[PDB]
Amino acid sequence: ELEALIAEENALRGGYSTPQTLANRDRCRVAQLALLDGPFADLGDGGCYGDLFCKALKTYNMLCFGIYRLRDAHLSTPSQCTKRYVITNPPYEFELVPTDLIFCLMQFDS
């Protein structure tokens, strides 16, 4: 429908807010969450990815689908590199470190 409107007018047309359009606002968005101080901080220190996924899905209806992990995290020696790489769909028994980011699809909240 938006495609047809853009085809018709070659622009974006504003409009007043109606309950149908406000209900159309509720979607899911891509986000990254840290385990340093969030509600899942007690699980990021050695916990498995499966418990995090189950808790996020049951409580906040949050769909975790990947880990953004520091490159120099498996090394025992400390490092100053802040680069992170992507792990797509880790298994249930995949371990977690506190310096990790979680990809998620978060619901709209009002």
Binding site: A7, E8, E9, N10
Partner: protein
């Protein structure tokens, strides 16, 4: 859109400032012949680039009912403004034929305009 046009002629032109002239007067003189009455004359609305149409206006400014809508024939808003559903005839003409090297692709804009209007 404010004025109402019914039973008129809409000439869509794919012109350009550097394009070759096509001599639009040869289209207006048969439609402006003295054999017709003044009330029987059909209004002519040219839809296209104004840069091209300024180079042709020196031979069209002596005719009674001619109007210009600066725009693009492929835009549906311009076609809806001139009441394309009420016109007696829509004529699609192309002026950028020499630029295209391939001869079979010289009719892309006219075919696209025809399909856009038909839909």
């Amino acid at each position: 859109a404010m004025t109402v046009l019914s039973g008129h002629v809409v000439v869509c032109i794919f012109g350009d400032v550097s394009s070759a002239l096509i001599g639009l007067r040869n289209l207006v003189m048969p439609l402006r012949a003295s054999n017709f009455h003044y009330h029987e004359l059909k209004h002519i609305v040219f839809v296209g680039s104004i840069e091209y149409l300024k180079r042709e206006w020196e031979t069209l400014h002596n005719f009674p009912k001619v109007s210009i809508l600066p725009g693009t024939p492929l835009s549906r808003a311009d076609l809806r403004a001139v009441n394309i559903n009420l016109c007696d005839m829509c004529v699609i003409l192309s002026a950028n034929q020499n630029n295209i090297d391939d001869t079979s692709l010289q009719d892309k804009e006219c075919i696209l305009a025809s399909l856009n209007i038909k839909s």
